[PDB]
Amino acid sequence: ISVRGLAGVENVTELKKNFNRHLHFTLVKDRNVATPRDYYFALAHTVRDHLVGRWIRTQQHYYEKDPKRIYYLSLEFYMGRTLQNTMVNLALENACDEATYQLGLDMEELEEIEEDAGLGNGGLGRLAACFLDSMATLGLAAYGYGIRYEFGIFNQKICGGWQMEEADDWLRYGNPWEKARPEFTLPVHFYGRVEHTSQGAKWVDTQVVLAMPYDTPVPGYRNNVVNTMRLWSAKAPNDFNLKDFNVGGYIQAVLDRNLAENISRVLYPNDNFFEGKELRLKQEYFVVAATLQDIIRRFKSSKFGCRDPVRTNFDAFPDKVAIQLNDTHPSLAIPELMRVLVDLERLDWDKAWEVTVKTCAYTNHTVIPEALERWPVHLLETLLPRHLQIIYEINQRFLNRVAAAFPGDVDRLRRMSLVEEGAVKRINMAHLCIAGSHAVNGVARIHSEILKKTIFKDFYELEPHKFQNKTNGITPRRWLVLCNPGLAEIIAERIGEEYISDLDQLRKLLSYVDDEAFIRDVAKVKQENKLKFAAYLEREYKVHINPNSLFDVQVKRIHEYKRQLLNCLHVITLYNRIKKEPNKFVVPRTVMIGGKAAPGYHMAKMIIKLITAIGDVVNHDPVVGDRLRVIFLENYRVSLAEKVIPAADLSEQISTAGTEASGTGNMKFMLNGALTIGTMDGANVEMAEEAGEENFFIFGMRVEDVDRLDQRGYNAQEYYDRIPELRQIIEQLSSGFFSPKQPDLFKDIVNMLMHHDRFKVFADYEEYVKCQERVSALYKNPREWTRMVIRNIATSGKFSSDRTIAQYAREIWGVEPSRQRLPAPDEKIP
Amino acid sequence: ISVRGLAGVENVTELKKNFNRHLHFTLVKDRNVATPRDYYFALAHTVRDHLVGRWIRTQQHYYEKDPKRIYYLSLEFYMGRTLQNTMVNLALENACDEATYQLGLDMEELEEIEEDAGLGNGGLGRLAACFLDSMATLGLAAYGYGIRYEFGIFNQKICGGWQMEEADDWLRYGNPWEKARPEFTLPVHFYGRVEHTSQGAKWVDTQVVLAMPYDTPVPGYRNNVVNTMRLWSAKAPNDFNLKDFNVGGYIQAVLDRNLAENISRVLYPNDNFFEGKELRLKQEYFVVAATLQDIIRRFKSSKFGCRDPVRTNFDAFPDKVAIQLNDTHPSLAIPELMRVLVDLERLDWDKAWEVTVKTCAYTNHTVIPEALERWPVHLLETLLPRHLQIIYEINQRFLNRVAAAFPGDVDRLRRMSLVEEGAVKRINMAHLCIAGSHAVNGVARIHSEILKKTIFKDFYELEPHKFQNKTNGITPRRWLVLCNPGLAEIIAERIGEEYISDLDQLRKLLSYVDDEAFIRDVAKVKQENKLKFAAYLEREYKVHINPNSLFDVQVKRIHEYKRQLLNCLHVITLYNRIKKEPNKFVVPRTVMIGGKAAPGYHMAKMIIKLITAIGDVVNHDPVVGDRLRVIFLENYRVSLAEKVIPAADLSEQISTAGTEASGTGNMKFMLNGALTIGTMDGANVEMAEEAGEENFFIFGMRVEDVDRLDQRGYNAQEYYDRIPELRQIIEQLSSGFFSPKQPDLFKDIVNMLMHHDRFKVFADYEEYVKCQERVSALYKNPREWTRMVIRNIATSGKFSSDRTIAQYAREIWGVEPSRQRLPAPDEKIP
Ligand SMILES: CN1CC[C@H](c2c(O)cc(O)c3c(=O)cc(-c4ccccc4Cl)oc23)[C@H](O)C1
Ligand SMILES: CN1CC[C@H](c2c(O)cc(O)c3c(=O)cc(-c4ccccc4Cl)oc23)[C@H](O)C1
Ligand SMILES: *Cc1c(COP(=O)(O)O)cnc(C)c1O
Ligand SMILES: *Cc1c(COP(=O)(O)O)cnc(C)c1O
């Protein structure tokens, strides 16, 4: 059937009875009233059973051996579905496929019932998920810590061509994967005030909110390692949240508990955008405060909570603990670690600071200013009074270091301060992170260089040793084996299975680039994937597409910097050219654009409307026929990505040079047989460098060109004046050609393009359409298109998150990865 | 060990492995980190497994045979713990005891970990629970329908002698007994308006709230029948509760979902008191609206949803459905049934009314005015516009019936109206219930008579056939076998086990009233129970009591009508007499008073303080020694009742004659070997009648005496003037003898007693203390005290809820009870 594992005789039999056990005893149903959802659940519980044994021994193992622990703090974990991924990592896929088949059920049908765990916005959250998978596969004692939102990223609906948001009630039917651990609930404090008494400061009169943990297992790839992802949920205490007496109403008090519990209610749906709301700050401290208590508790046990030098010497803390800050969201971990060490453990400031810096590391994800977290001092002042004091003290000591290093450089002083003066004083969380971390890394070579040359230039000059680079990656399990079994199979047929946990081995495929059989196969799986997607499209969304056309797709969050607008200009250009010479042959294309817009991002929502507006015109023009279709992919999310990416021919990665720190969707398309048209931005640079620029479709300005244009001054009118095709498009938009009933509907888009385009869409237009013409030429030559595809696939090995994690491990955490199988799962009950 | 079932070799072995299965796979724990709570859960899941098989076949059975279904609607189900009760009804207690013993665990220790399901205030909620147990034991196709409150009755804490309330987060660690059934979620409507169009009225522009059901199994006593209790939970839809667009904030919209969900958040903590709050009305409609949809859906299937006369003829509705309204709380079921039949099914009014009346029956629980539900018309007008219209129409037609029956009786017309004029117009829910039900019953003979003679005299004259009586009862399983195994054993030793489901057989014990062995035994188990309680007291609450004294207990909700105050007067009298003649012998007593006060009931809270204030003085007077202790039993609830009742010697049932409709605590004490001191009120009358007044300690005014006093006019001063002992007590309270630091602390109590005592505490004082002297005399004669106890126990058979349910079944529902064992639980998987 494929290499989804063995369908053993004893195990298929064992699976079936357990499926039946759960359907009866767990779901309390009988075959005569069970629905597909019930069957999905019976299966999930059956699969979940297989890793608890391993989960228990893995955690017991770490307790015995006591290795250095890695704590990955993130406010986002974009997990997606977990049934298939679990089967894959446990080598259960075929056995399960067989067992459900014999029970008369279609496993694929049941998998579609699982709800996505959408606890993330996009790239940042998905990276955390890929990292968790790699850390387990590399046998690291790692823990993912976050927040268990009861409502994840909103489900996107398109009404009248506009995006409608609706709550993502992903827990509605329950989550079979998590395990509530109410016995490990921890208290988190808010508000209050600081008392300075005799021997130290005291944080007093605080409001208490409880943090209840929920654990989800993270299985490594076929190595019997099962790590833990601990997500915190907010709960109101039953006392004060009722006991603070003297009238108000007993009923009201109880109803008001959903005020403390709102902290973990919903994920902020902003991608690369900072919104300074109090609720967000509460969420950030909540995850940090609870996590750190858990980390220290575990440490106090270790082998120090037995003997060792005897005397809680936190001198060894950094030798046993590593905390990775995914962006600045969990930045309060730095002043919180100090607070605990100084205020509670009573360590001297300098010793505490030494420990803090040595255990914390920070990962920067973007350079755009509106993504930068700058919290108003009055907010921190009211909510976290002691932390503000600690931050001022950290700032004080840091600036003294700067002054000593650059005597008289007064402007440098204000530039590096963690405190920004002005309208309202604010705290720069990025500066906080750099000062309190021993390592700061960018997510792609170009991005890391930009950090040193621009945004954090002063900090790099002060401590060059802190700055590093760790190019992002994606997990080959979910992003190849899981979503593209067909491709994984033909690759395995030639080079074996060892590449699944050693992607570099994909290079061996280079020697099949002229193999007639392989070329035919690679091309066949892509055709099958396209036919499958084309069917899914009519199944769940309904309105046909041609599977013989070039599948041109751009899927990612809607952003001005991502330039979905540039894509739109090209689509309209294609349309206008066909209308000019109807009977001229052009390579048929199905351009698919999908992605969610943050609810308050007006321009992003306007772009979605433009996309659907273009499709309304183009898709119903008889003269165009099936040569051009414009489709907006609704509710783009992890599970949808697993469907479109394997079906794509052309991957659109066209952000303005210097704006996309790295990107990861780009890597997903490369691994799945799509060719890339993009700018020299983020990881694109490293991808072209790995495959050879001749096997990549690069166009547009480079970072330097953008800077040159800025010195000069960007004037869109110029491009409008010199390019007739461009002029024609802008006039079509302006006149209502794409919005008959509301002729001025797109005035904001046009106005922006012409007068305030921070991302110079027009500047890359000419080179973009020219490059697109080259893609079409090559597509007309199936054999050569496929050969270039093989060159990309064979050279994508570097982009596996296993490589990324191995680098973090060695160059930042100080731990050694290992591909050693944990001593089987075997029963055991001590 | 006792007759808690057989500890079979194969089953104890089977139990142990399943306990281990659950500890490993379900709880994901290993013996090295498992805590008593984990062990309790492993056991609960193991026991829960044993009834799913039966649960499934019972429900399948009803589907095949299609008997008339009984729907018991109640806003309260005071269930308590369910582990032990399940073991008892499944005959698993000994096997489980053995198995956990071999696993090295103390089953009794684990049982204490289970949280009470306190979804009720007291009597009314506990009655619903006893009824569910009896209906299952009598093989009735019955369903209990209610609301799944996430917060039940508050946990009571005594601080400084005052009651403090704190949220009852009973779901904190999860509920192993329930099964969420999200697939059966139903929508409930609120607000909106009524459109009268061509062919009928339409309820439009409503706000939708979803009702998600949770099912809990209700096992019958050893007959393999497992019925269902379906509790509804409120959930906000994901659309409109987000989709009603045009600014406000996406985040806010999501947070605002906890506005629709507040409906099932908390139980109103009022016992026999009406609070006209909108949230309460919403709860009442919520349970009614969801339940009725479920009832009709099931009906449409039956055997009509196959063939029969073919044509949804609701003519057979009353032949297949019976809806019992537990008090007026679910009264909206009447106009809701009409709404559905008329507005949706399009039946003519008269046919719909015929069906409604024939399927509905109402149970009245009290005659006190402040418990009467009178909803303001403006509230129903805004929240349920169509129901108000239907109620006016029902009223209209009903009054026309009255006018035709009593021509010219204009005052009768206004008296019987469902609409009350005055300050604000209100709807009398009790009148609604009588008009739309074919049966109305009181809960004890005297209460039922009072209803016909007073409160509902006009209605009784109109339709005498509607009025009935159904004396309350308690289940002998939980209230004897479960809480008093020792007593159940010695009884079984002489007459067998058949009495557990046939309490009348207890009469056979009369022939052992002179048996020397039995007398010694009955007395021994009572002594063991007392020693056990006396230990529990120091264990969990700490401060010693003497197990050799007479255990004088009054446990029930704190009320002015229940007269805990009268008890207080007696206690103070005892104290004053000892202080007067210290060296005179008196029978030692431990008087225990426990019960919760509604949070807003000031007087009730003042009484609790008085009780603790008396104990402060009495318990620390050296001269008193161990002859008199006054203890306030904290957090009285079902699980605590299971502990004190079996340990009691004297049961205090002293409400003012005519105020306690029935009472059930009184029956619990009679069954467990306590003698009763009480007034001729509620069921007390029937209890004395069953045991013989010579074996009961009756005192005080009868209903007639109370009425006589009212004609005359009650003047407390008179009693104050003629009874020195009483005068001395009132002056002690007035002067601060019991509240040194706050001398006027009890001025409200004294003022009330002297000027506005609606319950004439003083009028029964003399006869009360005189009667108490008779109890002490008899206690001094162990042998005779015990012989009187045997006369009470042997004659309590009539008070089993099996008898009550058998009467409801035959005289109201039209179904025949059956003690036939359902065809085993045996595996099966169709
Ligand atoms: C001037 N104004 C433009 C819109 C912007 C804004 C909003 O008002 C609301 C939003 O939800 C977003 C968002 O999600 C991303 C970005 C963003 C992110 C990176 C680069 C450029 C931009 Cl415009 O901007 C947002 C902010 O008010 C400043
Ligand atoms: C005059 N006033 C007295 C208090 C009463 C009241 C409250 O203000 C608040 C409450 O929670 C209760 C309660 O639980 C029971 C009874 C009650 C019930 C039956 C008979 C007599 C009484 Cl007093 O009364 C309550 C109401 O405001 C009328
Ligand atoms: C991989 C992924 C992303 C990130 O895509 P980029 O193109 O790097 O912005 C966003 N959303 C989902 C659903 C993803 O799978
Ligand atoms: C039985 C019971 C009641 C009812 O007691 P009465 O004395 O009839 O008022 C109230 N609360 C609990 C916990 C009960 O078990």
φ and ψ at residue B347, rounded to 5 degrees: -85, 155
Q: How was this structure determined?
A: X-ray
What is the residue type of A245?
A: F
What is the CATH classification number for the domain harbouring B257? 3.40.50.2000
B638 Cβ closer than 6 Å to some ligand 4 atom: yes
Going B439 to B445 to B447 to B453, the CA torsion angle's sign is positive
Same structural domain, A179 and A239: yes
Q: Whole-angstrom Cα distance, residue B480 to residue B3?
A: 13
Q: Does B30 contact A269 at a Cβ distance shorter than 8 Å?
A: no
Q: What is the DSSP string of B182-227?
A: GGG-EEEEES-EEEE-SSSEEEESPEEEEEEEEEEEEE-SSS--EE
CA distances from A98 to A13, A87, A94, A379 (A): 10, 13, 6, 58
B226-235 and A675-678 strand pairing: unpaired
Map tokens 């949070």 to a residue.
Answer: B599
Tell me the three state secondary structure of residue A179.
strand
Helix (H, G, I), strand (E, B) or coil at B76: coil
d(CA B445, CA B468): 9
Domain presence at residue B308? yes
- DSSP assignments along A579-618, one per residue: HHSTTS----EEEEEE----TT-HHHHHHHHHHHHHHHHH
- Catalytic site includes residue B365: yes
Q: How far apart are CA B265 and CA A689, in angstroms?
A: 59
Q: What is the domain count for chain B?
A: 2
| Closest to A391 (Cα-Cα) out of A423, A432, A330, A331 | A432
Q: Across the interface, which of B28, B31, B254 has its CB nearest the CB of A266?
A: B254
Decide: A692 and A671 in contact? Cβ < 8 Å.
no
Q: Is A609 in contact with A766 (CB distance < 8 Å)? A: no
Sequence-distant (6+) residues with CB within 8 A of B38 are B23, B27, B29
Q: Whose CA is nearest to atom 4 of ligand 4?
A: B123
Q: Say what angle helices B123-137 and B801-808 make with each other, to 10 degrees.
A: 80
For tokens 């509902």, the residue is B456
Residues 6+ apart with CB under 8 A from A505: A495, A496, A498, A499, A797
The answer on A314 and A194 residing in a single domain is yes
CB contact under 8 A, A25 and B262: no
Do A452 and A511 sit in the same domain of this protein? no
Residue B305, domain member (yes or no) = yes
A376's tokens: 């108003």
Ligand 3 within 6 A of CB of A219: no
Helix axes B782-794, B761-779, angle to 10 degrees: 110
Establish if A830 belongs to a structural domain.
no
Q: Rounded to the nearest 5°, which phi and psi values hold at B8?
A: -55, 150
Mind telling me how many Å the CA of B263 is from chain A's nearest CA?
10
d(CA A93, CA B805): 54
Query: Which residue numbers of B belong to the known binding site for AMP?
Result: 30, 63, 297-306
Cα–Cα–Cα angle for A4, A7, A13, rounded to 5 degrees: 140
A14 inside domain: yes
| Residues of A noted as catalytic | 365, 556-557, 562, 664, 668
Candidates A30, A183, A254; nearest CB to B37: A183
Task: Classify A256 as helix, strand or coil.
Answer: coil
What distance in Å separates the CA atoms of residue A599 and residue B116, rounded to the nearest whole number?
44
Q: Which of the 8 DSSP states describes residue B360?
A: E
- Phi and psi dihedrals of A810, rounded to 5? -75, -45
Are B235 and B159 within one domain? yes
Helices (H) and strands (E) in chain B, counts: 32, 25
User: Which residue has 């667009």 as its token pair?
Assistant: B245
Chain A residue closest in CA terms to B28: A52
The span from the CA of A146 to the CA of A139, in Å, is 21
Q: How many whole angstroms from A461 Cα to the centroid of ligand 4?
A: 77
Tell how strand B77-80 and strand B186-190 pair up: unpaired
Regarding the beta carbon of A472 and ligand 3, being less than 6 Å apart is answered no
Residue B123 lies in a domain: yes
Q: Could you tell me if the CB of A389 is within 6 A of ligand 1?
A: no
SS3 A550: strand
Instruction: Pick the closest to residue B768 from B612, B563, B504 (CA basis).
Output: B563
B594 lines ligand 4 (CB under 6 A): no
A169, A258, A277: residue with CB nearest B258: A258
CA atoms within 13 A on the CB side of B770: 8
Question: How big is chain A by its Cα radius of gyration, in Å?
Answer: 28
Domain range enclosing B45: 1-473+801-824
**Which of A365, A601, A748 has most ligand 1 atoms within 8 Å of its beta carbon, as the pocket-test mutant?**
A601
Do A326 and A284 touch, CB atoms closer than 8 A? no
How far is it, in rounded angstroms, from Cα B729 to Cα B737? 10
Determine contact, residues A604/A158, Cβ cutoff 8 Å: no
Atom of ligand 2 nearest to the CA of B599: 11
> What gap in Å lies between CA B756 and CA B760, rounded to an integer?
9
Task: Spell out which residues of chain B touch residue A40, defining contact as CB-CB under 8 Å.
Answer: none
**Do B727 and B744 share a domain, yes or no?**
yes
In the residue annotation, B542 being an active-site residue is answered as: no
Are B182 and B320 in the same domain?
A: yes
C-alpha span between B19 and B12 (Å, rounded): 10
Give the span between the Cα atoms of B134 and B803, in whole angstroms: 9
User: Is the distance from CB of A696 to CB of A676 less than 8 angstroms?
Assistant: yes
| Contacts for A445-452: CB closer than 8 Å, 24+ residues apart | A445/A469, A445/A471, A445/A685, A445/A686, A446/A658, A446/A680, A446/A681, A446/A682, A446/A685, A446/A703, A447/A364, A447/A367, A447/A661, A447/A662, A447/A682, A450/A367, A450/A658, A450/A703, A451/A364, A451/A367
Q: Which of B266, B429, B427 is nearest to B333 (CA)?
A: B429
Handedness of CA B198, B201, B206, B212 (dihedral sign): negative
**Is beta strand B69-73 parallel, antiparallel or unpaired with respect to B142-147?**
parallel
Residue nearest to atom 11 of ligand 4 (CA): B122
DSSP state of A823: S
CB A792 within 8 Å of CB A675: yes
**How far apart (Å, rounded) are the C-alpha atoms in residues B630 and B568?**
9
Q: Is B600 in the pocket of ligand 2 (CB under 6 A)?
A: yes
Does residue B734 contact residue B750 with C-beta atoms inside 8 Å? Answer: yes
- A143 with A156, same domain: the answer is yes
> Cβ contact (<8 Å) for A265 and B254?
yes
- Determine, yes or no, domain membership for B695: yes
Q: What is the token pair recorded at B678? A: 């009480």
Distance in Å, alpha carbon of A183 to nearest chain B alpha carbon: 8
For the beta carbon of residue A609, count every other beta carbon within 10 angstroms. 21
> Could you tell me if B292 and B336 are in contact, meaning their C-beta atoms sit under 8 angstroms apart?
yes
Residue A217 CB less than 6 A away from ligand 3: no
Instruction: Please list, in sequence order, all residues whose beta carbon lies within 8 angstroms of the beta carbon of residue A491, skipping any fewer than 6 positions away.
Output: A499, A506, A509, A793
The edge-to-edge listing of strands for the beta sheet with A374-376 is: A374-376, A426-428, A419-420
Contacts 24+ apart (CB under 8 A), A717-725: A717/A754, A719/A762, A719/A763, A719/A765, A719/A766, A720/A754, A720/A762, A723/A765, A723/A766, A725/A573, A725/A576, A725/A769
In the annotation, is B556 catalytic?
yes
Q: How far apart are the first and last CA of chain A?
A: 39
| Same domain, residue pair A348 and A251 | yes
> Would you put residue B738 in left (φ > 0), alpha (ψ -120 to 50) or beta?
alpha
Q: Report the residue from A24, A258, A269 with minimal CB separation from B250.
A: A269
> Nearest-CA neighbor of B788 among B799, B769, B774?
B774
* Residue A84 near residue A482, CB atoms below 8 Å: yes
What is the Å distance from ligand 1's center to A607 Cα? 13
| DSSP string for residues in A19-78 | HHHIIIIIT---TTT--HHHHHHHHHHHHHHHHHHHHHHHHHHHHHH-PPEEEEE-S-EE
B180 vs A contacts (CB less than 8 Å): 174
Contact B257/A167, CB-based, under 8 Å? yes
Q: Which two tokens stand for residue B622?
A: 């050296």
d(CA B126, CA B132): 10
Tell me if A466 CB under 6 Å of ligand 3: no
Angle formed by the axes of helices A9-21 and A93-102, nearest 10°: 60
Q: Of the candidates A814, A830, A795, which has an alpha carbon nearest to the alpha carbon of residue A688?
A: A795
Task: Please name the residue that has the structure tokens 């002042």.
Answer: A381
Angle formed by the axes of helices B93-102 and B36-65, nearest 10°: 150
Domain check: are B642 and B696 in the same one?
yes
DSSP character at residue A637: -
Residues B4 and B62 occupy one common structural domain: yes
Q: Are B506 and B796 in contact (CB under 8 A)?
A: yes
Burial annotation A480-500 (CB, 10 A radius, 16+ → b, else e): bbbbbbbbbbbbbeebeeebb
Classify B383 in phi/psi space as left (phi over 0), alpha (psi -120 to 50) or beta: alpha
Q: How far is A367 from chain B (nearest CA, A)?
A: 26
Matching residue, tokens 């751009």: A554
Going by DSSP bridges, is the β-strand pair A440-442/A467-469 parallel, antiparallel, or unpaired?
parallel
- Sign of the CA dihedral with A19 first, then A25, A26, and A32 last: positive
Question: Interior CA angle at A657 toward A653 and A662, to 5°?
Answer: 60
The edge-to-edge listing of strands for the beta sheet with B426-428 is B374-376, B426-428, B419-420
Q: Who's near A507: CB < 8 A, 6+ residues apart?
A: A794, A795, A797
Nearest ligand for residue A601 CA: 1
How far from chain centre, in Å, is Cα A531?
A: 28
Question: Do the Cβ atoms of A293 and A186 come closer than 8 Å?
Answer: yes
3-class SS at A145?
Answer: strand
CB pair distance less than 8 Å for A56 and B28: yes
Q: Which residues pair with A678 in a beta bridge?
A: A653, A698
d(CA A471, CA B146) in angstroms, rounded, equals: 57
> For residue B829, is it within any domain?
no
Q: Which atom of ligand 4 is nearest to the CA of B668?
A: 1
CA distance A140 to A144: 12
The dihedral sign for the CA sequence A538, A542, A546, A552: negative
Contact B54, A24 (CB under 8 A): no
Q: Which atom of ligand 4 is nearest to the CA of B664?
A: 8
Give me Rg for the CA atoms of chain B. 28
Taking the C-alpha atoms of residue B269 and residue B88, their distance in angstroms, rounded to an integer, is: 31
The answer to whether B183 contacts A37, with C-beta atoms less than 8 Å apart, is yes
Report CA(A609)–ligand 3 centroid distance (Å).
21
Nearest to A255 by CA among A265, A241, A266: A241
CA distance B194 to B205: 9
Contact A24 B182 (CB under 8 A): no
Q: How far is the CA of A122 from the centre of ligand 3 (A)?
A: 5
Alpha-carbon span B434 to B446, nearest angstrom: 19
Q: How far apart are CA B279 and CA B209, in angstroms?
A: 13
A829 part of a folded domain:
no
Place of tokens 């104890």: B12
Atom of ligand 3 nearest to the CA of A562: 9
Q: Which of A333, A288, A262, A358 is nearest to A145 (CA)?
A: A288
- Side chain identity at residue A94, one-letter code: N
As a whole number of angstroms, the distance between CA A594 and CA A581 comes to 29
Chain-centre distance for alpha carbon B562:
16
B777 and B818 housed in the same domain = no
Q: Is B359 helix (H, G, I), strand (E, B) or coil?
A: helix
Name the closest-CA residue to atom 8, ligand 3: A663
Asked whether the beta carbons of B663 and B682 are under 8 A apart, the reply is yes
Q: Which amino acid is at A807?
A: Q
Q: Count CB-CB contacts under 10 A for residue B698.
A: 17
Write the DSSP assignment of B113-160 as a string of letters.
TSPPEEES-SHHHHHHHHHHHHHHHTT--EEEEEE--SB-SPEEEEET
B192 torsion bin: left (phi>0), alpha (psi -120 to 50), beta (else): left
Looking at residue A623, its amino acid is: V
Rounded Cα–Cα distance for residues A62 and B170 (Å): 34
For A184, the closest chain B residue by CA position comes to B173
Answer yes or no: do B495 and B376 share one domain: no
CB B121 within 8 A of CB B205: no
Which of B121, B270, B370 for a ligand 2 pocket mutation test, highest count of atoms within 8 Å of Cβ?
Answer: B370
Token pair listed for B496: 């067998």
Residue keyed to tokens 């009768």: B412
